[PDB]
Amino acid sequence: YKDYTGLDRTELLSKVRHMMSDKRFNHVLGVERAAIELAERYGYDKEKAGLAALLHDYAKELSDDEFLRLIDKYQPDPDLKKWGNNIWHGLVGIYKIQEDLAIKDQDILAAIAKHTVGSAQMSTLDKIVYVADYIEHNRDFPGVEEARELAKVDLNKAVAYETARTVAFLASKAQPIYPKTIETYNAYIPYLD
Template sequence: MDKSFAIELIEQKLPKKRFEHSLRVAETAVKLAEQYEGDAEKAELAGILHDFCKYDDLASMYQNVTQYELDSKLLSYGSEILHGPVCAAIMKHQYHLNDEDVLLAIAHHTTGRQQMTKNEKIVFIADYIEPRRTTKGVEEIRDMVYGGIGLDKTIYEISKRTVLYLVKKDVNVYQTTIDCLNYYNFNDSK
């Protein structure tokens, strides 16, 4: 899939604000790929497409989980978790996008996971820090990653903040996110 088709696809489906967010994530992913020697083209494509299913109705997402034989545990979660894996499955099966690195980056852009590829890391971080994000503490995360602290330490910090936020809200935390947090916690004695 080429970049112009991907942009056209999301522009037709997403609300204007989410479309613009996706383009900013793609731009941020390119910057990070250049800084950390990732594949800028793949990171950009994943950044463009990552929220393609963000506003799909929940029943449709659940059907996709079953149809594409995704992790059945996803059926216990809402669209915040589902839209990444469902989007990757739709891109693969309906749009014939077969680049595993791009698909993994789309699938895990919200949850992270253990042993992410470089481009998964880049898109995960880019989605969190794109220029219009105003999440409390986002400037610290931007300083970390642009200051050269590294992708892995930045992923740990994002995962930690995400888990703490979800716990405070009494929301179930997807196991993959906890696994990501633990995997990238280099302070833990392993």
């Protein structure tokens, strides 16, 4: 990752860990492990995959006010301020990552930005991060084990399954559903037919 960050993995782990709780940093390590496994399985650059996965939740624990300032400074979209952390920590978090690290790679940053909501046409790296986040080994929740099996077989099916489960979950709790989420939903459900 030094090629991407200018830092050894040891300073990098220090920086990431100092942004979040123990429990969350373990999640992030599990996501790194899972993304590297997925990259191996699907013929993708393991270093890009692991680095995007290590960084993906870098901003997860920023406060609302800190996000509102990053919005104002870097992407002042009126609608964006109506949402919250779930949406912000990836989409707006990338600005924090760039402030704190010498990361410029647009593939990595884009995979991080959309890790929560996806998009239509996700790249292989986007999908690796998206799926690793859901299936990493510390996770236990309704839908993970089917997700793990699918991931071993077809990345696009895993993407579809994860998205369908998340929409169902949000709807069951009457929580707002980000419009990109439904874009991702409709684009990938054909894989499950």
